[PDB]
Design a binder for this molecule. Sequence first.
Ligand code: 89S
Length: 246
Amino acid sequence: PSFDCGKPQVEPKKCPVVGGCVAHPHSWPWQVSLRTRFGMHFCGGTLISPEWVLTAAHCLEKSPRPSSYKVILGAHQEVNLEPHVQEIEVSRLFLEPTRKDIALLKLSSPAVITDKVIPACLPSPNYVVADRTECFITGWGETQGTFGAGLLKEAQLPVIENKVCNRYEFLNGRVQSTELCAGHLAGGTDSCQGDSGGPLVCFEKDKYILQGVTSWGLGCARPNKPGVYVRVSRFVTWIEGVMRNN
Ligand SMILES: CCCCCCCCNC(=O)[C@H](Cc1ccc(OCc2ccncc2)cc1)NC(=O)[C@H]1CC[C@H](CN)CC1
């Protein structure tokens, strides 16, 4: 075996995706790659239970056919998948009903939970991540010359409270209460194209809690332009309801 959610079996680097670093392999064991039937990566996701993956709804808007998608679990290299990697076809799609940028994928079979494939923990309903909390984003997205293309990367980003993120100098009112902001004022470190749908996790005493789903930004890693994430805590009741009833 039993593995606790949110507790990697390979301790992450937590280096203080553009910028950041290449992760230690299998140190973010909930990170998944959402792929076409031909195995091409197009989005991230987070394993939240053996049969359930949380991702961005925009990753699924082109096809309502679960057979258009497969989930890659336990990976480090994008291209040359490791022998233990699990490739599981999606069975059903559940888009958030108020059309927010979050969705669930039910897997056609449960993922086998191992020291390299472990779900993230969900937050408590309506939890608010406080300003300046240190969190991490992971993914196989663009690197903008910061090295590590093709390998799972991580970046440490502080949360910026919405009232600050919405100032003119930053995102000028765009951020909704069901979203959160994270990034460095000076830029240089951020999630980027190919990271959407992936996790934003924040360490709480002894485990990582999934607080955000990578959603959008005004470019990547620009100064004064932090990334925007769906605020997972505002969707926990809906997520739990989908899992309970499907
Ligand atoms: C020619 C089609 C191949 C596109 C695959 C490349 C995916 C790049 N992903 C994105 O641009 C997504 C949006 C996206 C676009 C198209 C997508 O669909 C492609 C697709 C093609 C074929 N089948 C399924 C999906 C999916 C997602 N946005 C992000 O990753 C955000 C960029 C800004 C960051 C700011 N911090 C936050 C992350």
